[PDB]
Structures are given as C-alpha cells and as structure tokens.
From a paper:
PGE2 exerts its effects through four G protein-coupled receptors (GPCRs): EP1, [name], EP3, and [name], coupled with different signaling pathways: EP1 induces intracellular Ca2+ influx through Gq protein, EP3 reduces cyclic adenosine monophosphate (cAMP) by inhibiting adenylate cyclase through Gi, whereas [name] and [name] increase the production cAMP by activating adenylyl cyclase through Gs. Although [name] and [name] receptors act redundantly in some processes, they exhibit distinct tissue distribution patterns and can activate different downstream effectors, resulting in unique physiological roles. Therefore, the PGE2-[name]/[name] signaling pathway serves as a key regulatory node connecting active inflammation and immune suppression in TME, and can be targeted by antagonists for cancer treatment. In this study, we present cryo-electron microscopy (cryo-EM) structures of human [name] and [name] receptors in complex with selective antagonists PF-04418948 and grapiprant, as well as with the dual antagonist TG6-129.
PF-04418948 is a highly selective antagonist for [name] with a KB value of 1.8 nM against PGE₂-induced cAMP signaling in GloSensor cAMP assay. To understand the structural basis of the antagonistic selectivity of PF-04418948 on [name], and to facilitate the future design of selective or dual antagonists, we determined the cryo-EM structure of the PF-04418948-[name] complex. This structure enabled the precise localization of PF-04418948 within the orthosteric binding pocket of [name]. The antagonist assumes an L-shaped conformation within its ligand-binding pocket and is mainly composed of three regions: A, B, and C. In addition, the 3-fluorophenyl ring in region A forms a cation−π interaction stack with the side chain of R3027.40. The carboxyl group interacts through hydrogen bonds with Y932.65 and T185ECL2, key residues highly conserved across the prostanoid receptor family. Region C is composed of a hydrophobic moiety extending into a pocket formed by TM2, TM3, and TM7 of [name]. It forms extensive interactions with residues T822.54, I852.57, S862.58, V892.61 in TM2, F1123.28, M1163.32 in TM3, and S3057.43, I3067.44, S3087.46 in TM7. In the case of active state [name], the top of the binding pocket of PGE2 is surround by the side chains of several residues from TM1, TM2, TM7 and ECL2, forming a narrow and closed binding cavity. in contrast, PF-04418948 is positioned shallower, with Region A and B occupying the top of the binding pocket, forming an enlarged and protruding pocket cavity that widens the gap between TM1 and TM7. In addition, PF-04418948 mainly forms weak van der Waals interaction, instead of strong polar interaction, with residues S862.58, T822.54 in TM2, and S3057.43, S3087.46 in TM7, which are not sufficient to drive a downward shift of TM7, blocking the subsequent rearrangement of TM7 and TM6, thus achieving an antagonistic conformation.
Author numbering:
A (entry chain A): 12 to 49, 64 to 272, 277 to 408
B (entry chain H): 4 to 144, 148 to 199, 207 to 228
C (entry chain L): 2 to 213
D (entry chain N): 14 to 23, 29 to 39, 46 to 53, 57 to 70, 79 to 119
The structure:
C-alpha cells in the first residue's frame, strides 16, 4: 500500500520522530562532552561510535522532517523515489558501520586480554583513527549492492520511511547473516573476556591470601619468643611465599627475582633458628619485611587497579552488546521468516522500529554508565 | 656422569662408632648440599642428616640429635658421617644424595641421583655355623613336600640349594627372620611327586648336607 | 613437623590399567612434593619433581597433579618394568624431609586355593634342644592371610614367626612360612599341634594337624 | 547358555565375597575373581556369559576383619541358580 500511496496519511503522529531526534542529539552531545572531559583505544573507539551514530541521526532525521513538512511520502517528495533509496541506504549503512565498530571494540578487548604481549607493544592512536575510515568503506561497499540491479528497496512504511526489499533479492538474507555472525562473534569475545577476568580474579585472590598469610606469619615471628614457634612460623611463611610465585613481562623478571630473594632470606632465618639465634632471626624477619616493602607491595597495587579498569570496560561493552542484541535480533528473525507471513503478522515494521531506537539507545546508555560505577564492580 | 658411592658400612657392636663415607663423581660438593637417607628392612625411607658445604651448616633428625656428626671435605670432595653410641634400631641401609641450593631449578629437582647405599647392622652376638634341620613330610602324603630348616646363623648371607643345583624347580626360599637371641632362621621347601639340600655359608665357611626321607 | 600421609598402601593391577596414588601433607606445601620409585634390591629413582614436570629420563607414562593439599600420581599404562615400590616425599626445606608409608604395586591374577602343609621338628632338632613346627602356605594369590597355632585345642599367642616371599616370575603366587618355637619339655608334654589358615578363597579355614 | 542373571546380597569398611557350591569373587572396600570367574562375571555380582557347568547354589559372605584376612562368619542363606 505504501508503494501506491503518495500522500501523508491523515492523523499520523509526527511527535515520535522529533522526540527521537532530540533525544539522539542530546545523548550524542552528552557522550561527546563526557569523552572530551577525559586516551585509550577503547575510549577512541567509543568516541568514533558516538560520532557515527550522530552522523547517522543528522542524516536520517532531516529526511523524515521534510516528509512531514511537505505532507508527502519519500516517493512523492523526491523524483523516482530517490530518497526512498538514499534514506534506506543510510538506514542500512550506519546500521552496519556502528555494528562493525562494536565488533572492533570486542576484538580490542580480546587483543587486550587474549594476547597480552601483543597489546603491550606500541599501539599508536593512528591505528584507531584509521579503523574508522576502513569500517566506513567496508560498510559502504557492502551496502552498495542495491541500486545496481542486485538488490531493490521497497516501502514498508506507516507513511514515512523505506527499507530493503524481501523477495528474489538475496541482499537482505546476506545482511541478516552478517549481522548474526557479528553478534555471535561479539558474544564469544565477551564470554572469553569474562572467563579470563574470572581467572584473573581467582589468581589475584590467591595472591592476596598468600600475602595475608605472609603478614600473619611475620606477626607471629615478631610476637613469638620460643624457638619451636619461630621455626614453625618461618616454615609456614616459606610455604606461603612458595605458594605465591606460582602465578614474560620485564617487571615479571624482577617480581619473581624478588620472591627468590625473599625465600632465600627465609632460609637464612631458618639456619639461624637451627643455630639457636632468636633475636638475630627476628632481625632477619625485619629484613624480610623491608624486602616486601621494596619489591612486592607495588605489584599487588598495580594488579588491583588494572583489573578494576578492565572489569569496568568489560561491563560497559557487555551492556552495549545487550542493547545491540535487543536491536538486531528482531530484524534477523524477520529476515528468515516467509515474506507472506512477515506481512501477515506485520512483524517487519516492528523490527525496523527497533533498529531505529538503536540509534537512541546506543549513546544514552554510556551517559548511564558514569565513572561512579564501582557499585556494579561490586557485583 | 653424576655418581655417589657409599662405603664404610657393615657390622658394629652396640655402643661403638662407625664412619661412613660418601664419594661424589661428576660434580663438586661445594655446589650441592649432601643428604643422607636411612631405610629400615621392611619399612620406608627416612632422612637422617644434611650438610651444606657452601655455608657450613648441618642438620640432623630429631631422633638422632646428639649421636651423629656429619662433615664434608672439599679437598677430597666427599662426605663423612660419624656415628657414636649406636643402638639396635640402627640396622638399616644408608643412601647418599645431593640436593641443589635454592636459587632456581637445582633446588626443585630434589634427590635426582641416589647412591647405591651401604648396610649397617648393630647387634651384639658372635658368628655361628649354619645348623641345618631337615623337614620330613607324612608317610601317606600324592604330591609331597620336602624341606630343610637352617637355624642359628648370625651372618646374613647364606646359600641353600637342592641336589647341588640340579633340582631347581619348585624350590621356595623364604627370607631370613631374626630371632630374639639374634640368630637368623631360614627354611627351604620343595614340592616333589635322592634329595639333598646343601647349605653353604660364606663367612663361617661351613657347608652342611642333609638327606630327607619320608616319615 | 610435616607428616606425609599416603593412603594407598597395597594395590594390584595388570598391564594397560590406570593406577592412581594419593599423597596428603599435614601442612600446606605449594609444590615441594616428589614421587620416587624403588625396586627390590635397588636404589630409588626420582620420577616426578615439583608435581608438574617430568624427570629427564623417566617414561611419560607417569604424571602428577595437585588439588588443594592432595597430590596425585597417575600411571596410564602399567608395564613389567614399572612394578616397584612408590614413595611420596616432601622437600619444603633442607631440614624438613619426611617420607610417606610406601606403596608397592602388585600383579593381579585369579584367586586360587592355598595348599597348607605341616612339618614337625626333626629328631636332630629335638636333640638340639629347641623344637620348631613349620606351617607352609603355598600358591595363594592374595597376600593377605592369617595363620593361627592351636595346641591341644588351645590357641597360642606370640612365639610365632611369619615369613612371606615375593611374587614368582611364572605366576604371582606368594609363599608363607610360619615357625612356632618351643622347648623340648613343651613338645613332650603337649600331645598334638595344628595350624589353621584363614584366607580369602576358602569357605572353611584349612586346618593341618600333627600328633607325636 | 547366554544368561545374564544378576544376584544381589544384603559393608563399606568391610569386604564382600561370593561362593559357589568354591570361591567366585570378592569385592574389597579391588576386586579379585577366581579362575573360571575372571572375565565372565563382574562384581552386586553381574553374572554374564553363563555356561551349563555353572548350575549351583551361590552364597554370600562378609569379611569381619579389616585387614582382609579372609575371616567369614556372616554367611547368607544363598540363592539357587540353574543355567540351561
Ligand atoms: C538508524 O538511525 C536513525 C536515526 C533516526 C531515525 C528516525 C526515524 O524516524 C522515522 C519514523 C517516524 O516517526 O516518522 C520513526 N518511525 C517508526 O515507525 C517508529 C515508531 C516508534 C518507535 F519507537 C520507533 C520507530 C518512522 C526513523 C529511523 C531513524 C534511524
């Protein structure tokens, strides 16, 4: 009916488009301001994603506004439904590009955790800045299949917009398959990062327990006076020290060496105990503490903050992914269904609407996840 | 290659002293700590003494404190363990081993090379010839069993054969069991459908023959 | 004062079977736990060091694992050259070295009926002054057995020495010898003697008696 | 022939044993089968690959000793089993 209709249906509510445009613009501006207040590669990718969403909104909304201003559909206001193609192209173009950006971020997280030494090397900002034009070109080349007799655009509308044709053209199925593959890849990367972060948390908890045992044994040595208790506490401290070095960075070449120095001193103290020197042994323990303050305290602090930031970013990404799923799963499901039925149940429209609200939901969630996010890190 | 040879073991009277030696070949004793392990007959291993020739510290087991003295000679590259005021529990086998110093891998590979070890026996008794006593089965007994029981021999190694080595099928030689008085007893039995059991002793230089007949 | 406790003390299997040995430490040890293999009449040899890596020279059939404070030695496939005693050792410190209780793998076979024989003291042994009664248990596969001495229908406690041999090359059948030592007066005053054998595979304990 | 009958008996710290009227099998805490029992049966005595020369009464026993000394005193009543 949209293909034959060339006039705006009376009684259609035009406030929805204006509200969505205003909300998207406000969210994009807030996200850009918050990012300008702060760079890491993930933040640059988020900034590029917000900029892409802003460009998509600023290219999509004026067409819908002119459609209401002229009281005519896209086929009527523009000759040979040119806008009905162009708009649709835009409605697909960013819909892929931003999606790809998401994958990139996920891949970054993988390259952040899956390959630590690969990420430790110098990764200049030029790479992140060059990722955006490459993603744009790939998305344009992929969405350039229509208008070349390979794919067609029809009007699945309530009176304002156009989209891809479902039928003999196989571009819609390929686009849905690409979206599903990207979603599966992002989910797999997120689960891998989840498992790696759980392993890191377990290792950090084990190291903290070993450090607490070392401190307790040192306090016992300082408070004890009998040779048997001092020897038992020294044995427990040596066991706890050997149970901590079990977890090839340059700093990792000193930390391990620092433990070797510690254990060695512990052995010395044990020798003193076998010689019957109590006070001397205590002095040795003091030296132990000094070594701890010299070499081990720093590593633990670095491990804590790093992991923290990691988890933060992770949760961010995860939320984003959830959003993307809620926005693209309806569309992929429609693509696989039979066109007849797809119209009979009027499912396609809904999916499209979801896609649209995607441009609203992508930036705002960022402003939702403020730096005071430690509560969520508590889990 | 890395080898450790023990020597000096044997028979020692109670309350005496014995000097065991452990000679290393293939490395230097100043780079590896020397440990001694003791194993009782019918039991497991047990660490008794340790010395570190790099610093000079020594250590012993709680049961052997005040009786054993370990030392190391770098000029001869060996270890010497002196034992005084021995007891009946000191009848065992001693093995020498090396454990590396802490920094790095040598420490982790604990006791990578074990020596042959030597036997030490602390018993207050005199050597006695092998008293062989034949064991005769019943007159009614298809298959029959003929045995010979040697008793009251102090030294450990003794040889028992049947038919001067001609009959070697079905011969069962049980391990020697130490009695309360300190003399060993062994039994050698064989299953048969002239049978002479010859028992020769190396230290006593005594060979005893016996003829077993059905009762 | 770490006291290593080794739960497996006697296990029987054949070639190709998987063997699992567990070692427990009284105190928490990170990785200072090793396994050693001692053959009868030979020196022990290190198999697994640090419970993770394998010794240079030993076959790859042996493996080590750690779980909390419990260490596990796993043998995938047994071989006729891997039948020896296994020992667990801790080496947390130079002066802290404590071994386990031992574990000797055995060759399993079909359970058979033990042949029980009795041997009274000979005339020359009586002339010597000491009478020794012998009870022989031949061909019983399971080593675990029990022998009881009964004189004049009265049980005897003590004064009995038991000796058990190893597995034969042809068939893994142990041999047991029980010797009861008494004086000439005790042998002349008492009338009859007997040894009763209780062992898995027999419905009723097999008794062997002699009368002077 | 070819029967697959299963026999049960009425523990954890002790050992169980089966007899035929001759020793059959023993379950300890390993499992030790007899000459003809090795390979055919599996020990709950899961009897498999029966033969007509195995028609006899199967009993049950529990070892009272904790050192596997073969001391059987709690002898069950037994169940009659007939093959072919
Ligand atoms: C992908 O990037 C952008 C950015 C802005 C956009 C604005 C748009 O507006 C056009 C519509 C109108 O209102 O005229 C909205 N339409 C609906 O059918 C509808 C109703 C309710 C609802 F919650 C969501 C949608 C047609 C459409 C697509 C857009 C896409």
């Amino acid at each position: 009916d949209c293909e034959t209709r060339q006039w705006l249906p009376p009684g259609e509510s035009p406030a929805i488009s204006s509200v969505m445009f205003s909300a998207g613009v406000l969210g994009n501006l807030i996200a850009l301001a918050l990012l300008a207040r702060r760079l890491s590669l993930f933040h640059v990718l988020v900034t590029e994603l917000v900029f892409t969403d802003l460009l998509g909104t600023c290219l999509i909304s004026p067409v819908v506004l002119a459609s209401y201003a002229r009281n005519q559909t896209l086929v009527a206001l523009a000759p040979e439904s040119r806008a009905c193609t162009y708009f649709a192209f835009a409605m697909t173009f960013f819909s892929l590009a931003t999606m790809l950006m998401l994958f990139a971020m996920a891949l970054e997280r993988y390259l952040s955790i899956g390959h630590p030494y690969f990420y430790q090397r110098r990764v200049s900002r030029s790479g992140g800045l060059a990722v955006l034009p490459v993603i744009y070109a790939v998305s344009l080349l992929f969405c350039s299949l229509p208008l070349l007799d390979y794919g067609q655009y029809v009007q699945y509308c309530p009176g304002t917009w156009c989209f891809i044709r479902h039928g003999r053209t196989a571009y819609l199925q390929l686009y849905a398959t690409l979206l599903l593959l990207l979603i599966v890849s992002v989910l797999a990367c997120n689960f891998s990062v989840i498992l790696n972060l759980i392993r890191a948390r377990r290792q950090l908890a084990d190291l903290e327990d070993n450090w607490e045992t070392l401190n307790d044994n040192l306090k016992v040595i300082e408070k004890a006076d009998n040779a048997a208790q001092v020897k038992d506490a020294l044995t427990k401290m040596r066991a706890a020290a050997l149970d901590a070095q079990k977890g090839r960075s340059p700093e990792m070449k000193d930390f391990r060496h620092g433990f070797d120095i510690l254990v060695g001193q512990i052995d010395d103290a044990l020798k003193l105990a076998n010689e019957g020197k109590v006070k001397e042994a205590q002095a040795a323990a003091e030296q132990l503490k000094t070594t701890r303050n010299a070499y081990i305290q720093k590593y633990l602090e670095r491990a804590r903050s790093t992991l923290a930031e990691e988890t933060d970013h992770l949760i961010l990404l995860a939320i984003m992914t959830i959003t993307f799923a809620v926005c693209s799963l309806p569309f992929t499901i429609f693509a696989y269904m039979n066109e007849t039925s797809s119209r009979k149940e009027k499912w396609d429209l809904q999916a499209l609407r979801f896609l649209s609200i995607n441009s609203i939901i992508d930036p705002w969630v960022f402003a939702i996840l403020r730096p005071p996010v430690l509560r969520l890190m508590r889990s | 290659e890395v080898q450790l040879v023990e020597s000096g073991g044997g028979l020692v009277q109670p309350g005496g002293s014995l000097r065991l030696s452990c000679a290393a070949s293939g490395f230097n004793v100043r780079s590896f700590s020397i440990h001694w392990v003791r194993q009782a007959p019918g039991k497991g291993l047990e660490w008794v003494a340790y010395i570190s020739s790099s610093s000079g510290s020594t250590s012993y087991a709680d049961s052997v404190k005040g009786r054993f003295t370990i030392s190391a000679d770098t000029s001869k590259n060996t270890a010497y363990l002196q034992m005084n005021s021995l007891r009946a529990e000191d009848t065992a086998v001693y093995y020498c081993a090396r454990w590396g110093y802490w920094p790095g891998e040598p420490w982790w590979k604990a006791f990578d090379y074990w020596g042959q070890g030597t036997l030490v026996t602390v018993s207050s008794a005199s050597t006695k010839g092998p008293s062989v006593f034949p064991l005769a089965p019943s007159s009614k007994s298809g298959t029959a069993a003929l045995g010979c029981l040697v008793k009251d021999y102090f030294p450990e190694p003794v040889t028992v054969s049947w038919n001067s080595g001609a009959l070697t099928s079905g011969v069962h030689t049980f391990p020697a069991v130490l009695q309360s008085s300190g003399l060993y007893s062994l039994s050698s039995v064989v299953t048969v459908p002239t049978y002479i059991c010859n028992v020769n002793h190396k230290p006593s230089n005594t060979k005893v023959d016996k003829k077993v007949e059905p009762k | 004062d770490i006291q290593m406790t080794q739960s497996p003390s006697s296990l029987s299997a054949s070639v190709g079977d998987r063997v699992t040995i567990t070692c427990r430490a009284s105190q928490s040890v990170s990785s200072a736990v090793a396994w050693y293999q001692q053959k009868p009449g030979k020196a022990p040899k290190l198999l697994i060091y640090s419970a993770s890596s394998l010794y240079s020279g030993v076959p790859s059939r042996f493996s080590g694992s750690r779980s909390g404070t419990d260490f596990t030695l796993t043998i995938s496939s047994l071989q006729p050259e891997d039948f020896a005693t296994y020992y667990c050792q801790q080496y947390l410190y130079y002066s802290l070295v404590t071994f386990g209780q031992g574990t000797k793998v055995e060759i399993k076979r079909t359970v058979a009926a033990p042949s029980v024989f009795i041997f009274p003291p000979s005339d020359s042994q009586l002339k010597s002054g000491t009478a020794s009664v012998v009870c022989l248990l031949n061909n019983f596969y399971p080593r675990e057995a029990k022998v009881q001495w009964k004189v004049d229908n009265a049980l005897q406690s003590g004064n009995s020495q038991e000796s058990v041999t190893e597995q034969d090359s042809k068939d893994s059948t142990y041999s047991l010898s029980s010797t009861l030592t008494l004086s000439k007066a005790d042998y002349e005053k008492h009338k009859v003697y007997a040894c009763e054998v209780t062992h898995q595979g027999l419905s009723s304990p097999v008794t062997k008696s002699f009368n002077r | 022939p070819g029967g697959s009958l299963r026999l049960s008996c009425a523990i954890s710290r002790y050992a169980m044993s089966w007899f035929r009227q001759e020793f059959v099998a023993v379950a300890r805490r390993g499992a030790f089968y007899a000459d003809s029992v090795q390979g055919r049966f599996t020990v709950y005595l899961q009897m498999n690959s029966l033969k007509p020369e195995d028609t006899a009464v199967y009993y049950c026993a529990i070892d009272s000793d904790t050192f596997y000394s073969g001391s059987y005193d709690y002898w069950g009543q037994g169940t009659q089993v007939t093959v072919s």
